[PDB]
Amino acid sequence: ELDLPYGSALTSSGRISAVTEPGELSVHYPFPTMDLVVLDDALKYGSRAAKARFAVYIGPLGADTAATAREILANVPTPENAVLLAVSPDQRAIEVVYGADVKGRGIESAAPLGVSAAAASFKEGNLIDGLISAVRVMSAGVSPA
Amino acid sequence: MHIEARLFEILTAFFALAAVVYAVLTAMFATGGVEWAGTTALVLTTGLTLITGTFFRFVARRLDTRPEDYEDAEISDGAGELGFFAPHSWWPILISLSFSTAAVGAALWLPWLIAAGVAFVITSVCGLVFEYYWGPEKH
Amino acid sequence: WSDALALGWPTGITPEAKLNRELWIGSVIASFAVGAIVWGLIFWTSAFHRKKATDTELPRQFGYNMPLELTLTVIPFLIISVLFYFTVVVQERMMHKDPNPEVVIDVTAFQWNWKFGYQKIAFADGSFDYDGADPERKEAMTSRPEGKDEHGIEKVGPIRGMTPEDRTYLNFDKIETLGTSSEIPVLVLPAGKRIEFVLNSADVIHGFWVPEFLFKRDVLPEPKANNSDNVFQVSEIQQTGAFVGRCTEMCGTFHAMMNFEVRVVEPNDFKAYIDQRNAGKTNAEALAAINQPPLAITTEPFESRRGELVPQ
Amino acid sequence: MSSTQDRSQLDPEVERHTGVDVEDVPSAEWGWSHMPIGVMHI
Amino acid sequence: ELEARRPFPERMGPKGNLIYKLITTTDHKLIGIMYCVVCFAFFLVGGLMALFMRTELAMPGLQFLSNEQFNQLFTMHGTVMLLFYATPIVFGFANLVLPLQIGAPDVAFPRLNALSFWLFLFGALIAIAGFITPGGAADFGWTAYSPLTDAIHSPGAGGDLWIMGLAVGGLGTILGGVNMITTVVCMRAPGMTMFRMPIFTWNILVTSILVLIAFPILTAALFGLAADRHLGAHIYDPANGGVLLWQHLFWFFGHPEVYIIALPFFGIVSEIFPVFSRKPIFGYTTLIYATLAIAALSVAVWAHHMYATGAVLLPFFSFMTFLIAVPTGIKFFNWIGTMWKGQLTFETPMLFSVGFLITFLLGGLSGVLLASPPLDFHVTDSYFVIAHFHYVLFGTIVFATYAGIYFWFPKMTGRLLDERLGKLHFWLTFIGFHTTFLVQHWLGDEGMPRRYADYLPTDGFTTLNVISTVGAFILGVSMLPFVWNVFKSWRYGEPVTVDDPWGYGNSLEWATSCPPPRHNFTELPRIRSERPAFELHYPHMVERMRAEAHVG
Amino acid sequence: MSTALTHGLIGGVPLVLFAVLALIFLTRKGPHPDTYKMSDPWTHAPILWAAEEPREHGHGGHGHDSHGVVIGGGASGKW
Amino acid sequence: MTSAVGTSGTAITSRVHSLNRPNMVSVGTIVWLSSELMFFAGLFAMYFTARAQAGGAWPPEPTELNLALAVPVTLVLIASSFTCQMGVFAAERGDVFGLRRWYVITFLMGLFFVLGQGYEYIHLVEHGTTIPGSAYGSVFYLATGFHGLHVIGGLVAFVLLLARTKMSKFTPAQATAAIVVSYYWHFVDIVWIALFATIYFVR
């Protein structure tokens, strides 16, 4: 066990209190703030119609891509009704996984559509735009439980 | 509360010295003797600090050292039931509005509006004070 | 260099003004030295950037330097004590209160203009058998035998038995150089003599300030009852000519329109002016007769119009 | 604890399916809850 | 082994989640935010009044203002900026972080501080409301000297509304002082002794006492004036000591007023230097004594604003005016000591904090020049004094408050204000400020009394006035970058997911989530010294902070 | 003096200074990381994003238990 | 709702346990009273300036202080303070009804003080001295009537606290409320003693 390289300490309770040097930031996400906001808006209210938690995983997903997609979907707060779209550009791979509750609501029929929407934009060269488009298409496909 | 009392004791000492020296050097070396405005103000700010410091000293002598006032105190020592702190309440804004009505009534010399504002201030202060004591309706 | 370093302080025209200007120069020199050293400290500690060579090692983290704190809390006391001693010695010549003024000017300042009385003149060389009038100082004692009630009240008056509408504190004189809204008053004073000013306000507080006297006073309504030493003296006025004077306390709306002049003329010019004013004449007529511009040359009685965009 | 949890069956009748949602207005189903933004703009 | 976080934090929030809090909020953090937002609104409103004065004063004629319209401007500008922006925002900052900085969950009487804010807001509005009346706002000066404020002079309603507006606003300030002083005395962390609470909390504590000493006198004086205006109570009749009574009464409040406006932001500046200098506040025990001395001395040196009156014991107040400058000198030197031999990084909080030092010093240096009555005679009631207390106020309650806003914006919003826009805002403010007021020293040194609506073309110093107007409009546009930064950083802008967006923070407010949990804490660390958060985040420094301390 | 000159000065000097300072400062690289180009490898740590869209039974963590992943679908693609 | 998440008998309790720690409400009220002392300091400054500027005969000829009536009211206010302290002693105990009795008679005697002050006011007014009628009359009325407004506010606080005691069970919080109200009443009587010594004896 080790805390962050500098300035982060485990508190009396579980929470770890961290710090950053004044100049720099915390999130460090390599995407524009505005299209990050756009993808957040998608995930948030373009999925309210689906009533199933939509999640995006840009990180790498190696070895058996499908299985790693399953066990990263496991981390979604309620995987029962969840739709995790994982893209690894280190492998140029896309994998969409669904929860048991989100099944038969058009999710299975929307999987190729969402994957194609992601793939087109990715080959165009826009990771965040492709993720947004895939989320939009999949959320349109899914119906409320 | 030793340091809390000592702060006001020091302030009282300084203000008493200031009032005394002002009174003396104004009774003599001034155009018209004692100024009677600065002198009284200094005397009664000495009184302000004296009252507050005397109460704080009484409390300090009546109280055993608290974790707050105790160096080398652990958080668990003070951990416990903190008292009641009022949650959300909309009575303060009504009190402010009632006092503003009374104030505008005083500014624009409108005795009717002054009376209305004072009645509203009484009502709003009653509401604020009774907020957490009003019992359930008895039907 | 002195003029520039004075930060726009006019070169005084009185011994008191000169001494005050010298004190101001000294105090500004001290203040600029202190400011220079402190700004040097700030711009030199701004050289303590977070050098990239600074590895995972925080600064000296010292704080709490008792000897340095003692030194830097002793020296400011020395500096301010020296400044206070200089201030006191200069202050001593703020109102010497010489009991033998060479000319006494009754400066009564009413709402939005001035009036100068020439209460008394007594030249040291021997001249000016002149004096103030004071028949017109009439009180307003509201000591009626009975008021609204039938008997008993016999009210004397609110304040010290008199009424606020008293005006007895005001003093009046034979030669009054009243300033009209369209005619800037020009108090003419003899050069080289000691000029006392007895200061009063007809209605409200305001402030008599001749910028080239390097001194101002606040003409209050009832200074004697307010424990205010309104009367103040000037030992001498060396330079002649017209010097602007201004109102330097809130008077009302036309607080910026109270400008006056203090025209210092030679003693013979003052002789002629006072004689010609004793003779029925106005201030402008007397100035023209002594061959000096009648109207205030340093300022004008600018437009009574509320402003530029008003349609006349 | 001197209170009894309430339950109500409100006679419902638009099906609040194109418009506002409980996430935005918690009591959308309980009454008129959304005015078209075109109305406010005009 | 990974968290499911939103791509970006929630921008604004659901419809109708804020309006009802404002009405009912008993949370100091939100009340402090209400103070800061409302106080800045009065800054912009009060600041706009100076631009009208600046435009009018740019040329000798009365281009677009009247004599009384201009007179109302500096009365309400001076009033709004001091009593409706500067004094209400010390309790805005106190409510913001003072409970955080002592480990408390809330203030002592949190419905009382809610009342204090609303008393501030509504009291302020009725004072500014004198403008809507046909006569105008209070024409007399902000000082509001006695006979000019009598019913005889300035008989309008605006003058009365001003008197009562201060009485209402004054009460909120008094009540706010009761919360902060009671909060510090009573509500404190289990380990935070009175000599280990941060300097800002100490500064607010002593400021609260000054508020209690000063403001009630004002309310007594204002009622006496209001009684005189409405009942002819002869309270300030000049035949009595009325003219010197009001000045004695007002300035006895007035001078503490300009120090409750000062001490809190000395703490804010003192909070920002150690965190960015990466070393303890140089001379902590000395600063608390310096703050205590200033408050003690400020009460008894009130009358040095009345040197021209020639009715006060002149030597007595000058000596204590020179005596109260020494403690402020100690405080100034300690701040440099904190910056000394420190790994300075001039982020936008330091940039403003250092600017405070530069502007305050020149204003301070002129302050002692005013402390000398012989110098105060010529320079009194002139634009030199206008330049003095603006280099000191603007330095102390614009540069420092902005430093406090920039420093504590993440700690109250969870978002970081843009650094580039902050640097643009500072230099516009710094370049703009020095332009407008530096020349005003020369302006007033030569004959130009303040509160002058117009001046003659023949009168000199026409070029200085335009230079002053140029500076103020540089200051006028300097508030656009700031408002834009806050507007686009409250809802957007680099989020902070950690405590201490500025590493090396102290004061225990950096020991909680940047948007603090309701009740300020889920974790109170073992408080050992004046830098609890620093001790927590850098345990290895704990020993060093004790070893290197004594050497100095 | 030169009413038009003074008006133009007070109206323009602030604008010129604002433009200069904006060019100096606003044109500086910000602290926000540059957008991730697809050609470059994914250097950032794994990112998992979630909607927080629905209500999750009770707010408190305890009592949620671990019912299971219950995976109920799949997909694949290669851009 | 099994029993309660907060194991407290009263929905409203002391702000901090007063046995070991300072009574927060008492601290706050004491500080506020210390401020009201400065308010009365401003009033005293006005009165003393007027007295200094008076020309020897401080109370003008028309005015004549009715000490015969001003002494009974002062004694009544002192008695009100004593009975208020007895009510506080009841408050420290659980004696709800003893507190109510003591504070009710306190309120009655404070009301008698207010009515006596009003009687003296009307007597002085009909005998010339009025706020616009004299500087002495104005400063005297300002000071004594601001104290009278404070006494009226104290009476309002007394009746309000009694109403509060009537609506909820007596608790340490409500005893503390009574204690702070008593602090206000004691401050009011102390400032009255100061005003009486200044007006009627010092003159």
Ligand code: HEA
């Ligand atoms: C934050 C607000 C603030 C602060 C800190 C101060 C601080 C000081 N003020 Fe200020 N003052 C005002 C606000 C403030 N003032 C206002 C608003 C007016 C109203 C104008 C009016 O109505 O008249 C006023 C008016 C005012 C006057 C009246 C001017 C006049 O009317 O003619 C005078 C002296 O006459 C004065 C003196 C001082 C002094 C000596 C200090 C000093 O206590 C501190 C500043 C001075 C320093 C020197 C600090 C730097 C010290 C060092 C660096 C140590 C080493 C240096 C030396 C030892 C010199 N002030």
Ligand code: HEA
């Ligand atoms: C906190 C106190 C404070 C602050 C910040 C300021 C700030 C400023 N003051 Fe201040 N000033 C005083 C307190 C203050 N002043 C006092 C106490 C007096 C003495 C009064 C008296 O003696 O009666 C005084 C006097 C005074 C005078 C003398 C008036 C006279 O005697 O004739 C002048 C003249 O130019 C002036 C100018 C300025 C300027 C240009 C600024 C600038 O720094 C202000 C910056 C401007 C802005 C921030 C406005 C820009 C914003 C907008 C245009 C947007 C508007 C939007 C809305 C309204 C929604 N001040």
Ligand SMILES: CCCCCCCC/C=C\CCCCCCCC(=O)OC[C@H](COP(=O)(O)OCCN)OC(=O)CCCCCCCCCCCCCCC
């Ligand atoms: C701020 C208030 C306003 C300003 C401050 C006022 C402070 C005064 C406080 C207490 C005074 C009470 C005692 C007053 C009675 C004493 C006797 C007297 O005053 O003399 C008779 C005169 C007539 O005299 P006359 O025409 O010459 O005819 C002689 C006939 N032969 O009556 C009067 O004017 C007196 C009437 C005064 C009423 C004041 C009511 C104040 C209530 C305000 C509520 C709070 C406001 C909050 C503001 C934020």
Ligand SMILES: [Cu+2]
């Ligand atoms: Cu003037």
Ligand SMILES: [Cu+2]
């Ligand atoms: Cu005048």
Ligand SMILES: [Cu+2]
């Ligand atoms: Cu001062």
